[PDB]
PDB file of all heavy atoms in Angstrom:
ATOM      1  N   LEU A   1      13.366  -9.089  28.732  1.00 55.52           N
ATOM      2  CA  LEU A   1      12.164  -9.972  28.735  1.00 55.52           C
ATOM      3  C   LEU A   1      12.517 -11.372  28.248  1.00 55.52           C
ATOM      4  O   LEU A   1      13.452 -11.551  27.470  1.00 55.52           O
ATOM      5  CB  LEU A   1      11.063  -9.381  27.855  1.00 55.52           C
ATOM      6  CG  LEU A   1      10.505  -8.025  28.285  1.00 55.52           C
ATOM      7  CD1 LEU A   1       9.512  -7.517  27.256  1.00 55.52           C
ATOM      8  CD2 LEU A   1       9.857  -8.118  29.656  1.00 55.52           C
ATOM      9  N   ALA A  13      -1.971 -15.555  21.139  1.00 52.30           N
ATOM     10  CA  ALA A  13      -3.061 -14.587  21.086  1.00 52.30           C
ATOM     11  C   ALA A  13      -3.509 -14.343  19.652  1.00 52.30           C
ATOM     12  O   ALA A  13      -4.711 -14.307  19.368  1.00 52.30           O
ATOM     13  CB  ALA A  13      -2.630 -13.277  21.741  1.00 52.30           C
ATOM     14  N   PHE A  14      -2.557 -14.180  18.732  1.00 51.40           N
ATOM     15  CA  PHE A  14      -2.918 -13.907  17.346  1.00 51.40           C
ATOM     16  C   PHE A  14      -3.520 -15.130  16.669  1.00 51.40           C
ATOM     17  O   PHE A  14      -4.369 -14.988  15.784  1.00 51.40           O
ATOM     18  CB  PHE A  14      -1.697 -13.412  16.577  1.00 51.40           C
ATOM     19  CG  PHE A  14      -1.513 -11.926  16.635  1.00 51.40           C
ATOM     20  CD1 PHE A  14      -0.957 -11.327  17.749  1.00 51.40           C
ATOM     21  CD2 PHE A  14      -1.905 -11.129  15.577  1.00 51.40           C
ATOM     22  CE1 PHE A  14      -0.792  -9.960  17.804  1.00 51.40           C
ATOM     23  CE2 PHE A  14      -1.742  -9.764  15.626  1.00 51.40           C
ATOM     24  CZ  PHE A  14      -1.186  -9.178  16.741  1.00 51.40           C
ATOM     25  N   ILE A  17      -7.294 -15.309  18.381  1.00 49.28           N
ATOM     26  CA  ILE A  17      -8.278 -14.376  17.845  1.00 49.28           C
ATOM     27  C   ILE A  17      -8.562 -14.685  16.383  1.00 49.28           C
ATOM     28  O   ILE A  17      -9.704 -14.583  15.922  1.00 49.28           O
ATOM     29  CB  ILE A  17      -7.809 -12.921  18.043  1.00 49.28           C
ATOM     30  CG1 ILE A  17      -6.545 -12.636  17.228  1.00 49.28           C
ATOM     31  CG2 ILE A  17      -7.568 -12.644  19.517  1.00 49.28           C
ATOM     32  CD1 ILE A  17      -6.011 -11.227  17.404  1.00 49.28           C
ATOM     33  N   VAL A  21     -12.192 -15.293  16.467  1.00 50.19           N
ATOM     34  CA  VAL A  21     -12.778 -13.959  16.349  1.00 50.19           C
ATOM     35  C   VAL A  21     -12.952 -13.555  14.890  1.00 50.19           C
ATOM     36  O   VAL A  21     -14.071 -13.313  14.434  1.00 50.19           O
ATOM     37  CB  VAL A  21     -11.942 -12.915  17.122  1.00 50.19           C
ATOM     38  CG1 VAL A  21     -12.545 -11.534  16.964  1.00 50.19           C
ATOM     39  CG2 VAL A  21     -11.845 -13.289  18.591  1.00 50.19           C
ATOM     40  N   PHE A  22     -11.857 -13.480  14.139  1.00 52.94           N
ATOM     41  CA  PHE A  22     -11.879 -12.914  12.797  1.00 52.94           C
ATOM     42  C   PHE A  22     -11.983 -13.960  11.699  1.00 52.94           C
ATOM     43  O   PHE A  22     -11.925 -13.600  10.520  1.00 52.94           O
ATOM     44  CB  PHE A  22     -10.629 -12.061  12.570  1.00 52.94           C
ATOM     45  CG  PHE A  22     -10.494 -10.925  13.536  1.00 52.94           C
ATOM     46  CD1 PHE A  22      -9.458 -10.896  14.449  1.00 52.94           C
ATOM     47  CD2 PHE A  22     -11.405  -9.885  13.530  1.00 52.94           C
ATOM     48  CE1 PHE A  22      -9.333  -9.852  15.338  1.00 52.94           C
ATOM     49  CE2 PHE A  22     -11.284  -8.840  14.418  1.00 52.94           C
ATOM     50  CZ  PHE A  22     -10.247  -8.823  15.323  1.00 52.94           C
ATOM     51  N   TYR A  25     -15.238 -13.204   9.738  1.00 54.71           N
ATOM     52  CA  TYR A  25     -15.098 -11.970   8.972  1.00 54.71           C
ATOM     53  C   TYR A  25     -14.115 -12.141   7.824  1.00 54.71           C
ATOM     54  O   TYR A  25     -14.373 -11.689   6.703  1.00 54.71           O
ATOM     55  CB  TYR A  25     -14.650 -10.836   9.892  1.00 54.71           C
ATOM     56  CG  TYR A  25     -14.299  -9.564   9.162  1.00 54.71           C
ATOM     57  CD1 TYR A  25     -15.210  -8.955   8.314  1.00 54.71           C
ATOM     58  CD2 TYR A  25     -13.061  -8.963   9.329  1.00 54.71           C
ATOM     59  CE1 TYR A  25     -14.897  -7.791   7.648  1.00 54.71           C
ATOM     60  CE2 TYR A  25     -12.739  -7.797   8.667  1.00 54.71           C
ATOM     61  CZ  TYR A  25     -13.662  -7.216   7.828  1.00 54.71           C
ATOM     62  OH  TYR A  25     -13.350  -6.054   7.165  1.00 54.71           O
ATOM     63  N   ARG A  28     -15.660 -14.023   4.847  1.00 53.33           N
ATOM     64  CA  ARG A  28     -16.632 -13.253   4.077  1.00 53.33           C
ATOM     65  C   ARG A  28     -15.940 -12.300   3.111  1.00 53.33           C
ATOM     66  O   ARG A  28     -16.354 -12.169   1.953  1.00 53.33           O
ATOM     67  CB  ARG A  28     -17.560 -12.484   5.016  1.00 53.33           C
ATOM     68  CG  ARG A  28     -18.561 -13.360   5.748  1.00 53.33           C
ATOM     69  CD  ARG A  28     -19.623 -12.528   6.443  1.00 53.33           C
ATOM     70  NE  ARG A  28     -19.053 -11.656   7.463  1.00 53.33           N
ATOM     71  CZ  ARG A  28     -18.895 -11.989   8.737  1.00 53.33           C
ATOM     72  NH1 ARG A  28     -19.264 -13.173   9.195  1.00 53.33           N
ATOM     73  NH2 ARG A  28     -18.353 -11.110   9.574  1.00 53.33           N
ATOM     74  N   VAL A  83       7.758  -6.058  20.553  1.00 38.15           N
ATOM     75  CA  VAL A  83       7.708  -5.856  21.997  1.00 38.15           C
ATOM     76  C   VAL A  83       9.082  -6.078  22.612  1.00 38.15           C
ATOM     77  O   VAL A  83       9.556  -5.275  23.424  1.00 38.15           O
ATOM     78  CB  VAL A  83       6.652  -6.782  22.627  1.00 38.15           C
ATOM     79  CG1 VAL A  83       6.684  -6.672  24.140  1.00 38.15           C
ATOM     80  CG2 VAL A  83       5.270  -6.450  22.094  1.00 38.15           C
ATOM     81  N   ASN A  87      11.449  -3.098  24.330  1.00 36.70           N
ATOM     82  CA  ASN A  87      11.824  -3.238  25.732  1.00 36.70           C
ATOM     83  C   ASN A  87      13.332  -3.350  25.901  1.00 36.70           C
ATOM     84  O   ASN A  87      13.866  -2.980  26.953  1.00 36.70           O
ATOM     85  CB  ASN A  87      11.134  -4.457  26.341  1.00 36.70           C
ATOM     86  CG  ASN A  87       9.706  -4.172  26.742  1.00 36.70           C
ATOM     87  OD1 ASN A  87       9.416  -3.932  27.913  1.00 36.70           O
ATOM     88  ND2 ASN A  87       8.802  -4.190  25.771  1.00 36.70           N
TER      89      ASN A  87
ATOM     90  N   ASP B  92       2.486  -4.391  34.237  1.00 44.35           N
ATOM     91  CA  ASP B  92       3.262  -3.345  33.590  1.00 44.35           C
ATOM     92  C   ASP B  92       2.671  -3.057  32.216  1.00 44.35           C
ATOM     93  O   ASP B  92       1.787  -3.767  31.731  1.00 44.35           O
ATOM     94  CB  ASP B  92       4.736  -3.743  33.467  1.00 44.35           C
ATOM     95  CG  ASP B  92       4.933  -4.995  32.643  1.00 44.35           C
ATOM     96  OD1 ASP B  92       4.011  -5.837  32.614  1.00 44.35           O
ATOM     97  OD2 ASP B  92       6.009  -5.140  32.026  1.00 44.35           O
ATOM     98  N   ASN B  94       3.601  -3.231  28.979  1.00 36.85           N
ATOM     99  CA  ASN B  94       3.595  -4.221  27.906  1.00 36.85           C
ATOM    100  C   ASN B  94       2.610  -5.343  28.201  1.00 36.85           C
ATOM    101  O   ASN B  94       1.959  -5.863  27.288  1.00 36.85           O
ATOM    102  CB  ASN B  94       5.001  -4.780  27.692  1.00 36.85           C
ATOM    103  CG  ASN B  94       5.630  -5.283  28.970  1.00 36.85           C
ATOM    104  OD1 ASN B  94       5.134  -6.221  29.593  1.00 36.85           O
ATOM    105  ND2 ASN B  94       6.736  -4.665  29.368  1.00 36.85           N
ATOM    106  N   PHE B 101      -5.713  -5.674  24.106  1.00 39.52           N
ATOM    107  CA  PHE B 101      -5.854  -5.968  22.684  1.00 39.52           C
ATOM    108  C   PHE B 101      -6.650  -7.247  22.464  1.00 39.52           C
ATOM    109  O   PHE B 101      -7.537  -7.295  21.603  1.00 39.52           O
ATOM    110  CB  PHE B 101      -4.478  -6.080  22.030  1.00 39.52           C
ATOM    111  CG  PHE B 101      -4.530  -6.496  20.591  1.00 39.52           C
ATOM    112  CD1 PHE B 101      -4.800  -5.570  19.601  1.00 39.52           C
ATOM    113  CD2 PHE B 101      -4.316  -7.813  20.229  1.00 39.52           C
ATOM    114  CE1 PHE B 101      -4.853  -5.948  18.276  1.00 39.52           C
ATOM    115  CE2 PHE B 101      -4.368  -8.197  18.906  1.00 39.52           C
ATOM    116  CZ  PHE B 101      -4.636  -7.261  17.928  1.00 39.52           C
ATOM    117  N   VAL B 102      -6.347  -8.295  23.229  1.00 41.68           N
ATOM    118  CA  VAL B 102      -7.089  -9.543  23.095  1.00 41.68           C
ATOM    119  C   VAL B 102      -8.517  -9.368  23.592  1.00 41.68           C
ATOM    120  O   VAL B 102      -9.474  -9.813  22.947  1.00 41.68           O
ATOM    121  CB  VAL B 102      -6.365 -10.674  23.846  1.00 41.68           C
ATOM    122  CG1 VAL B 102      -7.158 -11.964  23.755  1.00 41.68           C
ATOM    123  CG2 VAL B 102      -4.965 -10.864  23.293  1.00 41.68           C
ATOM    124  N   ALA B 105     -10.513  -6.952  21.225  1.00 39.78           N
ATOM    125  CA  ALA B 105     -10.759  -7.588  19.936  1.00 39.78           C
ATOM    126  C   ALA B 105     -11.920  -8.568  20.025  1.00 39.78           C
ATOM    127  O   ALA B 105     -12.780  -8.605  19.138  1.00 39.78           O
ATOM    128  CB  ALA B 105      -9.496  -8.296  19.449  1.00 39.78           C
ATOM    129  N   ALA B 106     -11.967  -9.365  21.092  1.00 40.77           N
ATOM    130  CA  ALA B 106     -13.055 -10.322  21.253  1.00 40.77           C
ATOM    131  C   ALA B 106     -14.398  -9.613  21.348  1.00 40.77           C
ATOM    132  O   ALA B 106     -15.352  -9.968  20.648  1.00 40.77           O
ATOM    133  CB  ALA B 106     -12.815 -11.182  22.493  1.00 40.77           C
ATOM    134  N   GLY B 109     -14.993  -7.425  18.048  1.00 39.12           N
ATOM    135  CA  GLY B 109     -15.230  -8.336  16.942  1.00 39.12           C
ATOM    136  C   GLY B 109     -16.592  -8.996  17.021  1.00 39.12           C
ATOM    137  O   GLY B 109     -17.281  -9.146  16.010  1.00 39.12           O
ATOM    138  N   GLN B 110     -17.000  -9.397  18.228  1.00 40.34           N
ATOM    139  CA  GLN B 110     -18.328  -9.975  18.405  1.00 40.34           C
ATOM    140  C   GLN B 110     -19.416  -8.954  18.109  1.00 40.34           C
ATOM    141  O   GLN B 110     -20.431  -9.282  17.484  1.00 40.34           O
ATOM    142  CB  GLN B 110     -18.472 -10.519  19.825  1.00 40.34           C
ATOM    143  CG  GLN B 110     -17.741 -11.827  20.058  1.00 40.34           C
ATOM    144  CD  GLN B 110     -18.337 -12.973  19.267  1.00 40.34           C
ATOM    145  OE1 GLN B 110     -19.496 -12.926  18.863  1.00 40.34           O
ATOM    146  NE2 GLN B 110     -17.541 -14.009  19.038  1.00 40.34           N
ATOM    147  N   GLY B 112     -19.040  -6.406  16.095  1.00 42.88           N
ATOM    148  CA  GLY B 112     -18.973  -6.066  14.684  1.00 42.88           C
ATOM    149  C   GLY B 112     -19.775  -7.010  13.810  1.00 42.88           C
ATOM    150  O   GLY B 112     -20.428  -6.582  12.856  1.00 42.88           O
ATOM    151  N   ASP B 113     -19.736  -8.307  14.119  1.00 43.28           N
ATOM    152  CA  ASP B 113     -20.460  -9.288  13.320  1.00 43.28           C
ATOM    153  C   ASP B 113     -21.970  -9.183  13.482  1.00 43.28           C
ATOM    154  O   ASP B 113     -22.701  -9.758  12.670  1.00 43.28           O
ATOM    155  CB  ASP B 113     -20.005 -10.700  13.683  1.00 43.28           C
ATOM    156  CG  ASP B 113     -18.589 -10.986  13.233  1.00 43.28           C
ATOM    157  OD1 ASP B 113     -17.928 -10.054  12.730  1.00 43.28           O
ATOM    158  OD2 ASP B 113     -18.139 -12.141  13.375  1.00 43.28           O
TER     159      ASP B 113
END
Side-chain angles (χ1 to χ4, degrees):
Chain A
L1 297 175
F14 271 79
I17 65 181
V21 179
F22 301 114
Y25 172 56
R28 288 191 298 270
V83 175
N87 279 260
Chain B
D92 61 332
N94 52 63
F101 175 81
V102 178
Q110 285 293 338
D113 291 5

